[PDB]
Amino acid sequence: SNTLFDDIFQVSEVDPGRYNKVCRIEAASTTQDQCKLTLDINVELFPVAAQDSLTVTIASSLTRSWRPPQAGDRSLADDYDYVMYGTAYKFEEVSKDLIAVYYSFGGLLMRLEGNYRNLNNLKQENAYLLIRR
Amino acid sequence: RGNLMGKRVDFSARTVISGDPNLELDQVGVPKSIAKTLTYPEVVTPYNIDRLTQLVRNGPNEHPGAKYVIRDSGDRIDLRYSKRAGDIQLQYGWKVERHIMDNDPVLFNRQPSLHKMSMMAHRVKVIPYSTFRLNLSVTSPYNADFDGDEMNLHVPQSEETRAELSQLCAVPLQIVSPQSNKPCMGIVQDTLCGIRKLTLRDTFIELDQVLNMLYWVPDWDGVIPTPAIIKPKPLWSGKQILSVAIPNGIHLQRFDEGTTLLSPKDNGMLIIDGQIIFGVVEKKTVGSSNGGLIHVVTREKGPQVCAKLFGNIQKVVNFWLLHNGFSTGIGDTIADGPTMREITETIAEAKKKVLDVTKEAQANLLTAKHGMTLRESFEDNVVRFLNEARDKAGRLAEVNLKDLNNVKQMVMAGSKGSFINIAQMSACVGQQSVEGKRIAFGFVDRTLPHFSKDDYSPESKGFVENSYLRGLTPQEFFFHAMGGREGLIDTAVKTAETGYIQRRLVKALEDIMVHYDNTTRNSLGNVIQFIYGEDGMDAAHIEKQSLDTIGGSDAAFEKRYRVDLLNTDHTLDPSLLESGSEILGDLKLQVLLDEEYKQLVKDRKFLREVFVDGEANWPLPVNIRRIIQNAQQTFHIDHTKPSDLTIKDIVLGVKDLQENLLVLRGKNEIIQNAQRDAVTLFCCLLRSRLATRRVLQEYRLTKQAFDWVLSNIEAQFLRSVVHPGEMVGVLAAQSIGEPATQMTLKKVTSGVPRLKEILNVAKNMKTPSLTVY
Amino acid sequence: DVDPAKRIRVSHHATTFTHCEIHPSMILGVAASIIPFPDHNQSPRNTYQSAMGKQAMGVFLTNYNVRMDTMANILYYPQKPLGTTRAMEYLKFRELPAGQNAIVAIACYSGYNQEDSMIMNQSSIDRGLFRSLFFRSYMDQEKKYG
Amino acid sequence: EEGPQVKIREASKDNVDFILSNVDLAMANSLRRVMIAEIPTLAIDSVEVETNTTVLADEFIAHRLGLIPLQSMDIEQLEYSRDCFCEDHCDKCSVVLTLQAFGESESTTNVYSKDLVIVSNLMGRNIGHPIIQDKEGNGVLICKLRKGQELKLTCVAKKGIAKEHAKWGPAAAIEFEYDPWNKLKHTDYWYEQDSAKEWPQSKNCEYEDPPNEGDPFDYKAQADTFYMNVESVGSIPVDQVVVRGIDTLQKKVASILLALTQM
Amino acid sequence: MIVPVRCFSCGKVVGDKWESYLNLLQEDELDEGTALSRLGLKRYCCRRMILTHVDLIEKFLRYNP
Amino acid sequence: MNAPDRFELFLLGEGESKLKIDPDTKAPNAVVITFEKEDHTLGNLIRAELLNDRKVLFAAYKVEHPFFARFKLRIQTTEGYDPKDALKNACNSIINKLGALKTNFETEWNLQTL
Amino acid sequence: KAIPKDQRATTPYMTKYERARILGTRALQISMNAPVFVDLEGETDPLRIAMKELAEKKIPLVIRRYLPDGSFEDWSVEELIVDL
Amino acid sequence: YDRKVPSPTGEYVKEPEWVLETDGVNLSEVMTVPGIDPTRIYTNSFIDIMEVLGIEAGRAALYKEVYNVIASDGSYVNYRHMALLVDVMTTQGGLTSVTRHGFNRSNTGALMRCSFEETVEILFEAGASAELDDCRGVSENVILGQMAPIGTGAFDVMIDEESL
Amino acid sequence: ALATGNWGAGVSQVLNRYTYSSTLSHLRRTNTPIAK
Amino acid sequence: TTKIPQIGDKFASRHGQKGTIGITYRREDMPFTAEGIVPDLIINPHAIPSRMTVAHLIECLLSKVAALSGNEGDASPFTDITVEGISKLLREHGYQSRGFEVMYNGHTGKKLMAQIFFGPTYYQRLRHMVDDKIHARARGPGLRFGEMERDCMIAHGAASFLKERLMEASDAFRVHICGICGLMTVIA
Ligand SMILES: [Mn+2]
Ligand SMILES: [Zn+2]
Ligand SMILES: [Zn+2]
Ligand SMILES: [Zn+2]
């Protein structure tokens, strides 16, 4: 029962650095020129290219072990394509006037930079990451 | 005297050893045939009448058996020959000499044993085939391999004797050793190579294989961790599963060259609550390194949990490696076509520099360097040129090799490998040398009859241009063999000399022990150290820590520690502290804060005198930074709200704690001073770590977390004091001799030759030097 | 214009030559003459080998069944090494060899082959791989002056 | 017939090149293993030596004897000596053979498996006949005799399985491949300059469609379509090695359902 | 001593191909590689078995007793 | 000498059963079965099939030490669904699967010339 | 030469050597059917029982710590704090 | 040589300095030469350092020497081990070597491992001088059937008439 | 002397026969009793 | 006596590195090649970098080519044979020129993510076998415990163990002693 962030980004770079399945994207945000994003993505399961336009929603719902099927016929809280799930080892840098946060997806890292998220994001593990089209 | 030399070695066996990925760190596989030979006398008691009665029935030929039953009268009934072997009625108080069984504590040892860690206690695991089996990580403390090594197993014979082994010698209690205040056991070879390949970002595991991996970790809790990727494919991270082998409450932070909180290179290491958040896992994290994962798990969870840790990790990685595979072939030693050309030119450039200096010398234009001969300095430059070549040639090959290159994969993980190796295999082998010089003119004015007289070129005097891959010319081959023989000869020497030095050191210190007064004395009762190690601490409880007070500019020192309640700018902002606003301009508190600052400034002076160098990292007990990282995780301290700590809380709190870090207790004046001295360095670390601004601005501790930090520091500290009865002398001798049995190879005297020269107090040194400033 | 795969050799700046080596590989003795590509190994390893070749099992003589000596080890199925040496011909190595040509895999498999140990194929052992005969013979007499 | 599906390419008395499709890799493998280790067979497992003046040692010869493939067509109609209710060996559980040879001529006299002679009663079941496939009906060369030397042995064939000793194995080798076009990406090709140019394209690349340049990785494809080839050693018809392979595997699982049952 | 009965690695029967191999060489003047392939020894594990064998028995038979 | 007889790989010694079923505690609806005298051949098999069942929450196997012939199988299933049954199911499902394969093969065999 | 219960300057904490010897002494006794002072919630292995007695401070033993000069201090196993 | 020194602002900075390295030693005389820093002169001959600067300086040097022999191979050993060695070699006011000085002793007991097939003589002298055996060694106590006053045996255990 | 190795030693030894090359080796071995 | 390869026995190639059998595996369990070829022996790659034993690797490459072509491989020192040369010949035979081959795990059938350097190499069975050194001496009614072993037990502070292990058979005799003169001149 929740959601925490939403917006669409302008991928300005997709670096694969010696990896063969992962790339580090850095897409600017449509709207607010402040909001930025750096993220690790498994390209093998959701390719990405420069100038693309991704919609990024955080959320935190729809820890107990996990089951595979059944739900695939039920709570399809996946109105997206790419779907990760990491933890917030978030260093609220409290840089200058903006506030950046960090997430860890099994090692695939992510970092948002804004300011109005003070009442938006968590300060605790649990947090899914969704992206569509 | 024939018995004062250990001959009649009863109750022990010896055999070839083999490695075993499925044994726990502290076990030893004992072949059934050897188990039936070694016995332990166990008194018949109601707690064990059945087991014994059963063993006696199995007899001397079936494993859970026994060899003799001894009755009250001391009579010995031989179960192998005896008309009543199968008709015995044990009675309380009798003794049954049973075979050693699973879990008995036994002493395992590999000679030459010049380490206490070369004689540890293990738990028995009776197994089939002959040969003893060991967990791979118990390998280095024994300095053992499996190309034929043999080890001895001794069976403790009494009850107090069993206890001594398992309570003092057991492998787990030796993970962290005092010889170098760090673990002496870590993850190696296959498991090391595998753990790295498993931790890369590109490594993902599918559901089918994840469930197996999970199930392989015995301390797992049937809770399938949610995938790092849920999208079109439930995929798990390699880091995710390894994290299951690490227990809860483990935190770890380390920054490498260019590591950030986004470490692009997947550099560094960041584990939080037993979940690796970022960084590839290799030798710096899982090796026997200082602050690594094993040092931490031990100190934080205790010896047993750490021992189990080696096995859990081994089982996961070894499984992930069995199904991933790893290999190496000739292919891995082949460098890029263009690279080889860059290499040939690099060497060709070296032969020119050498050719020039020769023409120079032949015209008589070279100037000798003071206190040196023309020929001496000539040789010098030629050798510098030729090594510069081998080296730069080697770097060109190293850079080339891709991340697929198996040789490079092993080097990146930490498991066997090194530049020099890749350099000699792929690029130039280099200059040979005997007695520190190039190959000498053994024939009149020439190295081999194949050259002309007076030929000082690199090919003549021993430079091997080819790599091992290319092969050596015959002349290169012979020169490389001349150099080779040298190493074989003195390897024999170094060996012999070190073994006698080690036995002389032990003999000189054997009787030195730590008494109950914390004094270190010899058999006579003479004082050697008025307090062991000048600090009363046990070396296995010491860690390298950074004494901040000592580094950087003064502006920085002041920005960091200065708290001026009487200045709008240099006060504690009311957001870091609850009572922040009403503290502004508080005269009485400011008096407390000035005492704290004057003390911090004295400390800095003091430290700068002791470590005139400027060095800040020194081994000290109680790892404060770790204690604080724990507090912040334990009390989920939010870095957003202001703390409820008072300035009196901190200042007076830290002040009180210092009066509790006790090494000595005597009530008189002398001892109390000795006590203040012994705790001086640690207290400087303490005061700089718990300075008011630091506690509120950096750590953000709440009154609860803070009070927790203070009591932990006291607990750990007291747990770090050395125990009276410590055979510190033998400990010392062995700690110096053991590594001196590892030295093998700018013009002075080092290595064993110099060490022997020292211990001998020779009035005729070989290299009497003076250094004048 | 030169083979980049070959090793780097020096030049023939001579008009003085009085002799020429029959063949450079003849600087080696018997044991080392059995090492394949010895010129591609680090020097001390050649020495180690030369020691071990003397601890191998072969067919010391074809008349082993008729001699009655203290100890003897005869390999069941000796094989001539796929990788030979030219000197190896005068040493009769192909005639009276030691060892066999094992199909070898350099790999990290179950973990049971670390720190210098090996994983051997049990099925190959059943079919005869590396079996050997061992003969020990005891001697004894009768009295002396009494 | 809905399910695993065989599709034979080659077939002869020795090999059976085929293509398993629509199956789990796990099953292809278990079957692959079973053929190598658990298909019953008859083989010499005891040799009594009356006379050996040959140049070889008894155990040396005996070892070879066991390696000589024997007729194991009706092996099921034979019981394991361990189950049999006799005392040691009998016609119900064993085949006895004899070997008598004498160096008569001055030329070296050879001894082959053909020279083996059954002495027990085969009761009509094709079993124990030494297999012969060479172009001269000689069989395996067991020993060589100089004039004057002799060899009088007595063997005893028994039912067994590879797990116990590789002599009882009916299989010689078992080719096995899948995804010849590295599409599932199960392996990561090692290379110097070009993955493709440096790695030999396999036979089975012809029986499949090379992936297309721009297709994104197919992450839901599993492993079906396994290209196998079974080589029989003779103790049993190739077709049988496979068939009984599936059979034993089948009986195995069966022995388990029956375990839960009487449990 | 004599032709191993089988290929150590795979099990292939090989002890019934020694004489043939010998003939393929003498009376047919073929080369070992071509000879071996004609006897069906296609994989190197089986090839090495025959190509590397040393028939020392032919020398043992030369002793009188 | 210390080497055990080879038949001990497939022959149940005395006092041993083909299966030992134990209830898992760490989790609900979980069982741990010990197969004596069996290896990866059956292990990876029953595991793979067990995984095709959707009402199955967990399935993994492992032979703790190559010296001994036995493996452990842990199955976790949906409430109401007995793990013991999923096994029976996986088994039968396998047995059938093979029967078909057997046929198809003997069928294709005949259509071959040689 | 004995030192009064007050004025002892030796450690309030038990040393690993004392723990090792006490457990071994006590275990020996339990191995010889000597009376036990705790409830064996299933234990049968002497040392294991001894460890239980220690944790519950029910081992009626005293440690005599000698000083290099000859004097000594007496600490009851009960007194000694066990943290190692 | 480069030298870490405090700069005027406080942070350590490298300040290169010319240093003289010699072949031969005469500390007392060179130490006195004008133009040098007698405060920092050094020599690897800890024997001369002792004779000119005293035993405490001798000790410090001996530690620096031993320590270098171990750092030369990159190896590391906790300070206290080398320190204990250095204190033993220094306790009696002079540099007492360790590589076996005495033909009889170092710190033993006229009972421990009978050295030289003529232990008799070791005992004859012990008698003639009234040698007092402390009995702290392991062998002496083995000969006496007792456990050595070390580690696990550096204290006695006794019954307690307190336990209720 | 030929049975011992007593000349004026170890000069005489039992011939190695472990392997054929080991025998050839022993027969061409050299010894140096007792600057570099 | 016939001696069959067992765990603990020593083996070595001709490049100065021996090893003992750690465990034996049956064919089914071994890893395999597409052609169904299985290894008679598996050694560890970690024993390659540091030994600098490149010849072992080249002997392998050479030996593969020789077996595939029935020609004797020339591994003679100081000749013009090359890895490039050998790699070319092996390639002509349809194999990946540097000795690697795709392999599948024997417990699963699934490929290995890595390819394996596979080929024949000459190995020697050494003497001195397990069953010859297994000596186990336990009398109730190396392998020694000497000075070095004792120093280790002293360092551990294990005093009673040292007492138990170093004490001889001799009977524990009871004597009386004067407290004034430390002599056994007491009449009891
Ligand atoms: Mn070794
Ligand atoms: Zn019968
Ligand atoms: Zn083969
Ligand atoms: Zn008296």
Alpha carbon dihedral H45, H48, H53, H56, in 10-degree steps, equals: 60
Query: What class, spelled out in words, does domain A1-133 have in CATH?
Result: mainly beta
Closest residue to B325, CB basis, from J6, J60, J112: J112
Q: Minimum-distance ligand to the CA of J183? A: 4
Give me ligand 1 centre to Cα I19, in Å: 24
Q: Contacts from B620-623 at CB under 8 Å and sequence distance 24+? A: B620/B542, B620/B543, B620/B545, B620/B681, B620/B682, B620/B685, B621/B537, B621/B541, B621/B542, B621/B543, B621/B682, B621/B716, B621/B717, B621/B720, B622/B682, B622/B713, B622/B716, B622/B717, B622/B720, B623/B291, B623/B299, B623/B543, B623/B545
Can you tell me whether residue D111 is helix, strand or coil? strand
Chain J environment of F39 (Cβ under 8 Å): 29
Nearest C-alpha neighbor of E43 from the set B330, D172, D140: D172
Question: Using CA atoms, how far apart are residues B45 and B766, in angstroms rounded to an integer?
Answer: 68
Chain B environment of D188 (Cβ under 8 Å): 404
Question: Using CA atoms, how far apart are residues B49 and E24, in angstroms rounded to an integer?
Answer: 75
User: Max Cα separation, chain D?
Assistant: 77
Q: Is the dihedral of CA H109, H115, H117, H121 positive or negative?
A: negative
Helix axes J83-92, J54-69, angle to 10 degrees: 30
To probe the interface with J, which of B11, B16, B75 has the most J CB atoms within 10 Å?
Answer: B16
Q: Angle J24-J30-J33 (CA atoms, 0-180°, nearest 5)?
A: 145
Question: Chain A: nearest CA to D218, how far in angstroms?
Answer: 8
Q: Minimum-distance ligand to the CA of D81? A: 2
**Interface contact G60-H163, CB threshold 8 A:** yes
> Do D12 and D89 have their domain in common?
no
Q: Does F62 touch chain J (CB under 8 A)?
A: no
- Which residues form the domain of D197? 1-40+167-263
Give me ligand 4 centre to Cα J184, in Å: 8
Amino acid found at H61: A
Residue B545 has φ and ψ, to the nearest 5°, of -130, 155
**Interface contact C106-J116, CB threshold 8 A:** yes
To probe the interface with D, which of J2, J25, J26, J28 has the most D CB atoms within 10 Å?
Answer: J28
**Interface contact D219-A47, CB threshold 8 A:** no
Kindly write down the DSSP assignment for every residue of B668-718, as one continuous string.
SHHHHHHHHHHTHHHHHHHHHHS-HHIIIIII---HHHHHHHHHHHHHHHH
Nearest C-alpha neighbor of B32 from the set B112, B118, B113, B133: B133
> Do D230 and D183 have their domain in common?
yes
| CATH code reported for the domain at E1-65 | 1.10.10.60
Give the count of beta carbons closer than 10 Å to the beta carbon of residue B449.
9
Report G:15-44 residues touching J (Cβ under 8 A): 17, 21, 24
* CATH number for the domain that contains residue D70: 2.170.120.12
Give the count of beta carbons closer than 10 Å to the beta carbon of residue B441.
16
Nearest C-alpha neighbor of D140 from the set D223, D221, D69: D69
Residues of C labelled as active-site residues: 116
Kindly write down the DSSP assignment for every residue of F16-41, as one continuous string.
--SEEEEE-SSSTTEEEEEEET--HH
Q: Does J30 touch chain B (CB under 8 A)?
A: no
The residue extents of the domains of chain E are 1-65
Chain C environment of E1 (Cβ under 8 Å): 76-77
User: Max Cα separation, chain G?
Assistant: 46
Give me ligand 2 centre to Cα D46, in Å: 14
Tokens of D1: 């017939």
Q: Please, are residues B687 and B598 in contact by the beta-carbon 8 Å criterion?
A: no
Question: Chain B: nearest CA to C56, how far in angstroms?
Answer: 15
> Do D48 and D156 have their domain in common?
yes
Residue B566 has φ and ψ, to the nearest 5°, of -90, 25
CA distances from J30 to C127, E7, E57 (A): 16, 16, 33
Closest residue to F30, CB basis, from B22, B211, B222: B222
Nearest C-alpha neighbor of B178 from the set A86, H77, H143: H77
Domain count for chain F, please give it. 1
* CATH number for the domain that contains residue D224: 3.30.1360.10
Question: Using CA atoms, how far apart are residues I22 and I34, in angstroms rounded to an integer?
Answer: 25
Closest residue to A22, CB basis, from B201, B222, B270: B201
Q: Does I18 touch chain C (CB under 8 A)?
A: yes
Q: Please, are residues B712 and B627 in contact by the beta-carbon 8 Å criterion?
A: yes
Q: Angle G47-G50-G53 (CA atoms, 0-180°, nearest 5)?
A: 160
Can you tell me whether residue B315 is helix, strand or coil? helix
Tokens of G47: 């040392």
CATH homologous superfamily for the domain B328-473: RNA polymerase Rpb1 funnel domain (1.10.132.30)
Q: Does E32 touch chain D (CB under 8 A)?
A: no
| DSSP 8-state class, residue B279 | S
Q: Is the dihedral of CA B24, B27, B28, B33 positive or negative?
A: negative
Question: Using CA atoms, how far apart are residues C113 and C5, in angstroms rounded to an integer?
Answer: 34
Give the count of beta carbons closer than 10 Å to the beta carbon of residue B345.
12
Question: Chain H: nearest CA to G2, how far in angstroms?
Answer: 13
Chain G environment of H162 (Cβ under 8 Å): 60, 62, 76, 78
Q: Does C100 touch chain I (CB under 8 A)?
A: no
- Which residues form the domain of F85? 1-114
Q: Which residues pair with residue D5 across a beta bridge?
A: D21
Give the count of beta carbons closer than 10 Å to the beta carbon of residue J57.
29
Give me ligand 1 centre to Cα B144, in Å: 6
| DSSP 8-state class, residue D77 | G
CATH homologous superfamily for the domain B175-327: RNA polymerase Rpb1, domain 3 (1.10.274.100)
Chain breaks in chain C (C to N over 2.5 A) after: none
Annotated ligand binding at D205? The verdict is no
Question: Using CA atoms, how far apart are residues B395 and C59, in angstroms rounded to an integer?
Answer: 48
Rg (CA), chain C: 22
Q: Please, are residues D250 and D257 in contact by the beta-carbon 8 Å criterion?
A: no
| DSSP 8-state class, residue B167 | I
**Interface contact E47-J67, CB threshold 8 A:** yes
Tokens of B383: 């050798």
Residue partners of C137: CB distance under 8 A and separation at least 6: C68, C69, C70
Nearest C-alpha neighbor of B142 from the set B188, B177, B185: B185
Q: Domain end: D139, D166, D193, which one?
A: D166
Chain D environment of E18 (Cβ under 8 Å): 141
Does domain B38-100 fall into CATH 3.30.1490.180? Answer: yes
Beta-strand relationship, J32-33 and J103-104: antiparallel
Q: Domain end: D142, D166, D190, which one?
A: D166
Burial class (CB in 10 A: 0-12, 13-18, 19+), B746: exposed
**Interface contact B328-C106, CB threshold 8 A:** yes
Amino acid found at B102: D
Q: Minimum-distance ligand to the CA of B150? A: 1
Q: Angle B513-B515-B516 (CA atoms, 0-180°, nearest 5)?
A: 155
Amino acid found at B148: G
* CATH number for the domain that contains residue G34: 3.90.940.10
Domain count for chain G, please give it. 1
Tokens of D7: 């599709």
Chain B environment of C6 (Cβ under 8 Å): 470
| CATH code reported for the domain at B11-37+101-174 | 2.40.40.20
- Which residues form the domain of G74? 1-84
Nearest C-alpha in H relative to G24: H152
Closest residue to B216, CB basis, from F24, F59, F62: F62
Residue partners of D1: CB distance under 8 A and separation at least 6: F100, F103, F104, F107
**Interface contact C133-D67, CB threshold 8 A:** no
> Do D161 and D172 have their domain in common?
no
The residue extents of the domains of chain A are 1-133
Give the count of beta carbons closer than 10 Å to the beta carbon of residue B175.
28
Kindly write down the DSSP assignment for every residue of B545-605, as one continuous string.
EE-GGGSS-HHHHHHHH---TTSSSSS--TTTBGGGGGGTT-HHHHHHHHHHHHHHHHHHH
Q: Minimum-distance ligand to the CA of D88? A: 2
Q: State this model's resolution in angstroms.
A: 2.8
Question: Chain H: nearest CA to G9, how far in angstroms?
Answer: 16
**Interface contact D192-B331, CB threshold 8 A:** yes
Task: State which approach was used to obtain the coordinates.
Answer: X-ray
Can you tell me whether residue J126 is helix, strand or coil? strand
Binding annotation of J: 178, 181
